[PDB]
């Protein structure tokens, strides 16, 4: 006959939506230890033999995990920082001498008038008949808070490790699009290095495909899903801020000072970006090979834009400073890019919650790689704004499963009767 | 630092084995269910959320040890019974599955019948054998 | 307004004694391992989560509920150059767990998968007769 033998420790699993925990390698960065646990000793891997498993990067929750975490881990270092209400006054702002930088004047924000400031053009808004006068762009909307100056901004090579009873899986097939099953599967204790890099229209400091380029989308027979393309051979970018800046902290309200911009040592020159015009041309022609598969043959050339300056420009960070680059001229050997530096931003496009940038004195220049692009057809035109699909650029393999340990199977062994 | 290949079949390693073959890695799966390797290297320097995930993992563990305690099978890993099989669950015979099929597929044959198995193991193996004690 | 001397034993009282004198003392270190502004609660889970692990490893080895037990795993003389009666009559435990610290991982794998895994497939198939 067949008696049912209990088996504890059998390795099967469901799929579970659960909570992971961040592990960052290792001063006073917000990602250093006030969000995560310290340095990663070693990532592991066990590769599994005879196993098939489906995957999806659009029904995934790890990609929803950062968007529910970086919205708040960024927010943690914004509660104690200095709110700036009393600056919202009449802003008599006239042009700087050697007019996208305006010398402003306003009555005093004292602890006890006719004070002074000068700052960027894209944070003022015009008002009624007394011309050459302005106001901030968010007063009658919501609050505005400057960053604390002792706060870092560098994306850190994080490692999502996995908690108890939860194994992170990883497919390894080179021929893996955004969906479908996989065969060469493997289990890790912990993910590889991921850096939290914020970008529109592109993909900065990401990760490289295996000497190839493969676009990914789910409903690409719609205009619904964003066609996201990874790039082999990162294109190096150079972006500068040549204006040798000065700062000061003039007094704000009862017992506080407000970090603004002093005088611009060195005359007014536009901060721009560079890209080698040879490499960009060949790189697009790599993609249209793969576009031919989902279609001299360069039927696609066209660019579009329109709407949000977060989306119209090219938004990213550099040295703790936000950029907004014009990208129409680049799409269609160095290439100068007109790139704007706004100072009052919106953090993850949420209505109301605004953040003010620290005006850094001196000069700023940074360089970076590029591993991917953002496109929308109907021919392909660059999208931007959806922050979550930046995160899907990395986690297009992984998965979180819950271990069921326990199982049964019949056999020809019966429990002997106790005497 | 170097490292030679495994000769002891690490975590989830025999997931492709047959049911008569993956039984040799039952010990590795059970040990690392609880807390994994210990993370959080005493760095308490600066919440609430953290510890709910820590408390659930114990409750997942204590669910099963009590359930093996009712099933007369605490401490063991493999134990027999007095319950015969009912082939309406799955009539698939012995070597059709045993030396032919992994564990992920055997669970996808018995998942509809799961709670039905648990009452029968409870009653006719220990609620039964409580009436043999005397 | 109280006080009398020691009667049975103390907590960690045998931790300078020999193995042959500490082996009759294990219960006092066995009882008080578990019983004893959020930061009390974060202690009250780590004290649990350490107890289950040591309980779990005894469970896998066919040695749950006993304080001591034996296996059939052979001691390997490569692990210890110490003589037998030096161990049971001269060495304390605190010294002893600095000497076999490196080999400990080899030991625990060579209990489960060596024997108590193997003592179930052998055990289940002693039926049919």
């Amino acid at each position, epitope marked *: 006959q067949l008696w049912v033998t209990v088996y504890y420790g059998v390795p099967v699993w469901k799929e579970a939506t659960t909570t992971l925990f961040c592990a960052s390698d290792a001063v006073h960065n917000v990602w250093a230890t006030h969000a995560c646990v310290p340095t990663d000793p070693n990532p592991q891997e066990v590769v599994l033999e005879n196993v098939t498993e489906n995957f999806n990067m659009w029904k995934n929750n790890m990609v929803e995990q950062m968007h529910e975490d970086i919205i708040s881990l960024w927010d943690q270092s914004l509660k104690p920082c200095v709110k700036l209400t009393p600056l919202c006054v009449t802003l008599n702002c006239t042009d700087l001498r050697n007019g996208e930088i305006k010398n402003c004047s306003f009555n005093i924000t004292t602890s006890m008038q006719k004070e002074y400031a000068l700052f960027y053009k894209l944070d003022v808004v015009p008002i009624k008949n007394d011309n050459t006068s302005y106001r901030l762009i968010s007063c009658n909307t919501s609050v505005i808070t400057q960053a604390c100056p002792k706060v870092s901004f560098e994306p850190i090579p994080i490692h999502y490790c996995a908690p108890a009873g939860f194994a992170i899986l990883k497919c390894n097939d080179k021929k893996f699009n955004g969906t479908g099953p996989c065969t060469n599967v493997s289990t890790v*204790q912990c993910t590889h290095g991921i850096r939290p890099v914020v970008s529109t229209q592109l993909l900065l400091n990401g990760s490289l495909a295996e000497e190839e380029v493969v676009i990914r989308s789910a409903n690409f027979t719609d205009n619904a899903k964003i066609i996201i393309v990874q790039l082999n051979k990162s294109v190096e970018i150079n972006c500068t801020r040549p204006n040798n800046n000065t700062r000061k902290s003039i007094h704000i309200g009862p017992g506080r000072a407000f970090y603004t911009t002093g005088e611009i040592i060195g005359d007014i020159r536009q901060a721009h970006c560079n890209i080698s015009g040879t490499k960009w041309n060949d790189t697009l022609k790599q993609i249209v090979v793969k576009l031919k598969e989902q279609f001299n043959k360069t039927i696609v050339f066209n660019h579009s834009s329109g709407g949000d300056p977060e989306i119209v420009m090219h938004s990213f960070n550099c040295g703790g400073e936000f950029f907004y680059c014009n990208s129409t001229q680049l799409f269609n050997g160095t290439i100068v890019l007109p790139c704007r530096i706004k100072q009052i931003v919106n953090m993850w496009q949420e209505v109301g919650k605004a953040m003010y940038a620290p005006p850094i004195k001196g000069q700023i220049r940074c360089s970076s790689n590029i591993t991917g692009l953002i496109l929308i057809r109907d021919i392909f035109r660059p999208g931007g704004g959806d922050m979550r699909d930046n995160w899907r650029s990395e986690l297009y393999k992984y998965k979180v499963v819950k271990i069921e340990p326990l199982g049964i199977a019949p056999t020809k062994a019966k429990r002997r009767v106790v005497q | 630092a170097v*490292g*030679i290949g495994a000769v*002891f079949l690490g*975590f989830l390693g025999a997931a492709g084995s047959t049911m008569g073959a993956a039984s040799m890695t039952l010990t590795v799966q059970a040990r690392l269910l609880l807390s994994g390797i210990v993370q959080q290297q005493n760095n308490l320097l600066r919440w609430g959320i953290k510890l709910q995930a820590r408390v659930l993992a114990v409750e997942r563990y204590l669910k099963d040890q009590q359930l093996l305690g009712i099933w007369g099978c605490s401490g063991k890993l493999i134990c027999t019974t007095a319950v015969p099989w009912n082939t309406s669950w799955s009539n698939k015979s012995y070597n059709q599955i045993w030396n032919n099929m992994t564990w992920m597929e055997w669970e996808r044959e018995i998942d509809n019948y799961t709670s039905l198995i648990y009452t029968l193991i409870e009653d006719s193996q220990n609620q039964q054998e409580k009436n043999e004690q005397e | 307004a109280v006080g009398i001397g020691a009667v049975f034993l103390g907590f960690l009282g045998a931790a300078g004694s020999t193995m042959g004198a500490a082996s009759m003392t294990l219960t006092v270190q066995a009882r008080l391992l578990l019983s004893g502004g959020i930061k009390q609660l974060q202690a009250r889970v780590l004290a649990v989560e350490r107890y289950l692990k040591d309980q779990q490893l005894l469970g896998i080895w066919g040695c749950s509920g006993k304080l001591i037990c034996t296996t059939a795993v052979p001691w390997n003389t490569s692990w210890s150059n110490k003589s037998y009666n030096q161990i049971w009559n001269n060495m304390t435990w605190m010294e002893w767990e600095r000497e076999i610290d490196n080999y400990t991982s080899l030991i625990y794998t060579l209990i489960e998968d060596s024997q108590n895994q193997q003592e179930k497939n052998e055990q289940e198939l002693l039926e049919l007769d």
Partner: antibody, heavy 135, light 111 residues
Framework: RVQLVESGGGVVQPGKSVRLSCVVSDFPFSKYPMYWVRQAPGKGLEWVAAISGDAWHVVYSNSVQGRFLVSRDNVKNTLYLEMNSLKIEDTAVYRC????????????????????????????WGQGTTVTVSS | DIVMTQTPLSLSVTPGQPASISCKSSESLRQSNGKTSLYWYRQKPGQSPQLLVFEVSNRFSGVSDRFVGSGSGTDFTLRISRVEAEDVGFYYCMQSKDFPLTFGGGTKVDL
């Protein structure tokens, strides 16, 4: 003092195979990894090979795989390197090297089920020995 | 795999000099145990190599008190104050993060 002495030197023709020797002094040697380094006649230095104190694991460089063979004998306190299928451009001076620390036994990772030997830098060489491949 | 460089190698000296030579590598070679793999050796010409520094700012015992190296991450420097007449030879930088092991040219030192 740990006085590593090196011997077995020989100058031959290409296509042949020779073997060196490295003997130690005042030294337990059962728990110590060894190395082999290469001073080409005008060059700086480059690592060749490595062995455990167990003589269980042997890592090489990319080049001499399928040419060399390292083997300890802690009874003899003597290291062998039978260098099969010599090249002419591998004419150099070869040495042995005690590791800086004492290595230990492997510690088995409980999760991976996968051993890990530990190898660090070296501190004490021998006097040098000569192998030359010419015609 | 992982490689590294040195300074201009030939550096004539002065008795009582702050001599310093960097060795920038293509990796942050900090191991899992927090021990930074770095090994400064030296050979006089006609001699075997000889250990100077076994880890970042850790002189090897039995060697005199004038050899204070440093470094972190990619770049690693070896500062020597009180330059003497027994300093002639080459300086060998060494990785120990992962096999294979590398070295450098060996910075020439004369008067």
């Amino acid at each position: 003092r740990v006085q590593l002495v090196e011997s077995g030197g020989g100058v031959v023709q290409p296509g042949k195979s020779v073997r060196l020797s490295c003997v130690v002094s005042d030294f337990p040697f059962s728990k110590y990894p060894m190395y082999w380094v290469r001073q080409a006649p005008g060059k700086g230095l480059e690592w060749v090979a490595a062995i455990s104190g167990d003589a269980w694991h042997v890592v090489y460089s990319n080049s001499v795989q399928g040419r060399f063979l390292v083997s300890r004998d802690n009874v003899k306190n003597t290291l062998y390197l039978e260098m099969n299928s010599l090249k002419i451009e591998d004419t150099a001076v070869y040495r042995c090297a005690r590791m800086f620390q004492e290595s230990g036994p492997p510690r088995l990772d409980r999760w991976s089920g996968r051993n890990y030997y530990y190898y660090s830098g070296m501190d004490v060489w021998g006097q040098g020995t000569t192998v030359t491949v010419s015609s | 795999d992982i490689v590294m460089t040195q300074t201009p190698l030939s550096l004539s000296v002065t008795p009582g000099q702050p001599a310093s030579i960097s060795c920038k590598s293509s990796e942050s070679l900090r191991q899992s145990n927090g021990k930074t793999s770095l090994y400064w050796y030296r050979q006089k010409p006609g001699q075997s190599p000889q250990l100077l520094v076994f880890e970042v700012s850790n002189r090897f015992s039995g060697v005199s008190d004038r050899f204070v190296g440093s470094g972190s991450g990619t770049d690693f420097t070896l500062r020597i104050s009180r330059v003497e007449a027994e300093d002639v030879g080459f300086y060998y930088c060494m990785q120990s993060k992962d096999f294979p092991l590398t070295f450098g040219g060996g910075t020439k030192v004369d008067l």
